[PDB]
Amino acid sequence: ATRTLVTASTPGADMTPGQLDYTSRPLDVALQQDGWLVVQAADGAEGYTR
Amino acid sequence: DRLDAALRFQQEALNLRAQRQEILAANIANADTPGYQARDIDFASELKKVMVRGREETGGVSSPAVDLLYRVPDQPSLDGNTVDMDRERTQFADNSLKYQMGLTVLGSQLKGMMNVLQG
Numbered sequence: 001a002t003r004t005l006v007t008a009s010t011p012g013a014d015m016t017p018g019q020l021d022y023t024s025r026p027l028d029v030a031l032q033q034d035g036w037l038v039v040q041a042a043d044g045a046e047g048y049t050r
Numbered sequence: 051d052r053l054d055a056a057l058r059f060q061q062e063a064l065n066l067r068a069q070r071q072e073i074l075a076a077n078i079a080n081a082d083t084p085g086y087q088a089r090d091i092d093f094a095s096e097l098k099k100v101m102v103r104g105r106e107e108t109g110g111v112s113s114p115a116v117d118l119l120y121r122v123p124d125q126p127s128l129d130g131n132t133v134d135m136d137r138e139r140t141q142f143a144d145n146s147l148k149y150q151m152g153l154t155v156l157g158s159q160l161k162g163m164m165n166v167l168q169g
Contacts, residue, residue: 002125003125003126003127003128005128
């Protein structure tokens, strides 16, 4: 056994929060670390976002 | 009968050389086909077999009655063929020289006979 191949992969994503821009608007919100806002997805399902 | 028997060993060896080279050329042709195990024959055992019992064919699509054995692969491959090109080209060159040797021996014997007959 000598031949071993390479396969690229994307193991999930990065959950480290970014930097918060302070905008003087009441509707722009930022969640806690490892927290998600819930939206109704495109196909009538549920999705989570930041 | 006597002359046929005296020239039969080298003639049969040369025919088996031709068939082995056909097999090796088939292996070289299928070298990039995925899922092709390389085939080869044991020259000595098949030569003795053809010697004791005459040549035979499966049909006659026709093919010889030789046993097509599988070559042991050297290193693995994802496509799934065991045709290792170094082995194929070494066996091809060796079979080439041995076929030329058979031609030389048979031609020498036939001249060695025309020398006697000629007068």
